Amino acid sequence: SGAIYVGNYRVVNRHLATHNDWANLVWEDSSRDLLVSSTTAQGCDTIARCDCQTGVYYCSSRRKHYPVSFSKPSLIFVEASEYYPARYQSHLMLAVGHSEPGDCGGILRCQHGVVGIVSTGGNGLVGFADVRDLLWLDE
Numbered sequence: 057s058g059a060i061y062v063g064n065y066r067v068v069n070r071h072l073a074t075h076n077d078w079a080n081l082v083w084e085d086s087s088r089d090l091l092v093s094s095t096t097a098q099g100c101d102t103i104a105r106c107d108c109q110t111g112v113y114y115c116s117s118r119r120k121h122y123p124v125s126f127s128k129p130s131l132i133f134v135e136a137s138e139y140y141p142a143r144y145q146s147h148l149m150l151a152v153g154h155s156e157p158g159d160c161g162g163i164l165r166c167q168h169g170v171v172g173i174v175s176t177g178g179n180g181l182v183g184f185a186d187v188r189d190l191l192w193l194d195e
């Protein structure tokens with residue numbers, strides 16, 4: 057679990073969004089596993105605006121942060137589950153690093169700020185949904 061709070065917005069994994077998130081929906085993209093809902097309070101997370109391929113992510117299944125090298129956002133494969141059937145996930149970045157179910161929502165950060173959130177992973181790999189292209193989160 058986990059979310060990003062920037063201004064009057066809450067960014068969560070679309071498969072983990074609550075009834076409240078859907079009742080205050082701003083934007084969602086099933087292919088990206090993202091959903092953004094509105095909030096009454098002001099968020100202070102800084103979104104990174106860069107092309108970094110190194111950063112640190114929080115791994116709840118180990119209560120630890122890990123440094124990782126990650127790929128550029130791209131279209132990659134995901135099987136099925138209570139949430140989606142096989143499809144290409146867009147805007148996804150992979151890194152070699154520990155993850156298993158429950159780890160979705162952990163933040164990936166670089167020196168410039170928030171890069172993305174854990175969304176998938178498998179056999180020793182972890183997948184992050186990028187948020188750096190969503191320029192409207194700041195305005």
Ligand SMILES: CSc1ccccc1CC(=O)N1CCC[C@H](CCO)C1
Pocket residue numbers: 071088089134137139140145155156157158159160174175176177178179
């Ligand atoms: C860190 S998730 C993980 C890691 C290792 C193993 C298994 C998982 C769970 C997982 O991969 N999924 C269930 C939730 C939806 C995911 C796709 C989202 O577009 C797929």
Ligand SMILES: [Zn+2]
Pocket residue numbers: 104105106107108166167168169
């Ligand atoms: Zn950066």
